[PDB]
Amino acid sequence: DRLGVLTTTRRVVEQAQAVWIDHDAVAQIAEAFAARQVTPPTWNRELHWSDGREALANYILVLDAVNFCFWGEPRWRIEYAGAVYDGYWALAASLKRALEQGVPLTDASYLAEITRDDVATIFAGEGEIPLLDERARILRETGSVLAERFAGRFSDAIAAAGRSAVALVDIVTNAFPSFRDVATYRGEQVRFYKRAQILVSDLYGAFDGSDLGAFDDLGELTAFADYKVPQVLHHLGILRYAPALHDRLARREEIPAGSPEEVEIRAATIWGVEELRRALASRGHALDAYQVDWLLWDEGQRLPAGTLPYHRTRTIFYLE
Numbered sequence: 342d343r344l345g346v347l348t349t350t351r352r353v354v355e356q357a358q359a360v361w362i363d364h365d366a367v368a369q370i371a372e373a374f375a376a377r378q379v380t381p382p383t384w385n386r387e388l389h390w391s392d393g394r395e396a397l398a399n400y401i402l403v404l405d406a407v408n409f410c411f412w413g414e415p416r417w418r419i420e421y422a423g424a425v426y427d428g429y430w431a432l433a434a435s436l437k438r439a440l441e442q443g444v445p446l447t448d449a450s451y452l453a454e455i456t457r458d459d460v461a462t463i464f465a466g467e468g469e470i471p472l473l474d475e476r477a478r479i480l481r482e483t484g485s486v487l488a489e490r491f492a493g494r495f496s497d498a499i500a501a502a503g504r505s506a507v508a509l510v511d512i513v514t515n516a517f518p519s520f521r522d523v524a525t526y527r528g529e530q531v532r533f534y535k536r537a538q539i540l541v542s543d544l545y546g547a548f549d550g551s552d553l554g555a556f557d558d559l560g561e562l563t564a565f566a567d568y569k570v571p572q573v574l575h576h577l578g579i580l581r582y583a584p585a586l587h588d589r590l591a592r593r594e595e596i597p598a599g600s601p602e603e604v605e606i607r608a609a610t611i612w613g614v615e616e617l618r619r620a621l622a623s624r625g626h627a628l629d630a631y632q633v634d635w636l637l638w639d640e641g642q643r644l645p646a647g648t649l650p651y652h653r654t655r656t657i658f659y660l661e
C-alpha cells in the first residue's frame with residue numbers, strides 16, 4: 342500500500358460514527374454483479390478529446406486538474422454537438438469543444454497565462470461552472486509547473502513513473518499542489534488522492550494500456566472518493582448513514598471539506614469499493630478497484646429519482 346490511501350482510510354472506517362458498511366449488502370450485491378459478470382463501460386471516446394501522444398497526455402492532466410464539484414442551482418449545463426450536458430460530461434464536452442475551435446489548452450504557455458474571462462468562455466452555458474475562479478488558478482498552476490518542471494510535456498512526468506501507476510500519482514502530487522488530496526480525522530492524516538488516481542486511470546483509458554497509458558500496477562489504485570460513488574453505494578445499501586448525516590444529505594445541507602462527516606463518507610467509499618472488489622473476486626469475478634469504481638460511477642448516471650441526494654462539499658484549495 343505504497344500511497345497509504347487504504348491504510349489511512351481503514352483507520353477512519355473502524356472509528357466512523359456517521360457512516361458504516363453493511364457487509365451483508367456487499368455480499369448480496371457481489372452475488373448479483375458476479376452472476377451477470379458486470380464490467381465497467383469502455384473509456385468514453387465520444388466526449389473525451391484525442392490527438393498526438395504529447396497533446397493527449399497534457400489534455401488528460403488538464404481534464405483531471407479541474408475534475409471536481411459540478412453541483413449548484415441554477416444547474417451548470419453546456420450545449421455541445423447538438424446535445425446538452427451537465428456534471429462531468431459538461432466538463433469533458435467544454436474542453437473538447439474549446440480544443441476543436443483551436444483553443445490551445447494543451448500548451449503550457451497558454452495554460453500558465455489563462456484569464457478568468459478565457460475559462461468563463463470555455464465553460465459558457467446555462468448557469469456558471471462552480472468555483473470558476475478556482476479552475477482558472479489551477480489551470481495557471483498546472484501550466485507553469487508543466488513549463489518549469491517537465492519542458493511543457495506531461496509525457497516527461499509519465500516517463501519518470503516507469504509504468505508504475507502509484508509512482509505517477511506520487512510525481513503529480515509532488516509537482517502539482519492542487520492534486521494534494523489529504524485530510525485529518527481525530528488528529529491522523531487521511532490520504533485520498535481522488536484526482537491524481539483518476540488521472541492515472543484516464544491515461545490507461547485514453548492510450549488503451551499502451552505507450553503513456555501503460556501501467557504494470559493499476560491494481561494498486563483505490564476508488565476515487567467523489568460524491569456519486571458513495572451515493573451509488575448508499576442506493577445499493579452498502580453505505581449506511583446515521584440520523585443527522587442522513588437528514589443533512591436529504592435537506593441538501595452543504596458539508597464542510599475535511600469535516601469528520603465528509604472524511605467518513607470518503608473513507609467508507611474507498612472501503613465500500615475495496616470490500617465489493619474482494620467479495621466479487623471471492624465469487625470468481627476478479628476486477629481492479631478502479632474498475633469497480635468506474636462501474637459504480639456509471640450506475641450513478643442513471644439512479645432512480647427519489648434516491649438520497651449526493652453529499653454537497655465545496656472542494657477547497659485554501660493552501661493554493
Ligand SMILES: Nc1nc2c(c(CN[C@H]3C=C[C@H](O)[C@@H]3O)cn2[C@@H]2O[C@H](CO)[C@@H](O)[C@H]2O)c(=O)[nH]1
Nearest residue numbers: 385408409410428429565567568569570635638
Ligand atoms: N469515483 C469517480 N468519480 C468520478 C469519475 C468521473 C469520470 N470518469 C470517467 C472516465 C472513465 C469512466 O468510465 C468515466 O466515464 C468523474 N468523477 C467525479 O464524480 C463527481 C461528479 O462528476 C466529481 O467529484 C468528479 O471528479 C469516476 O470514474 N469515478
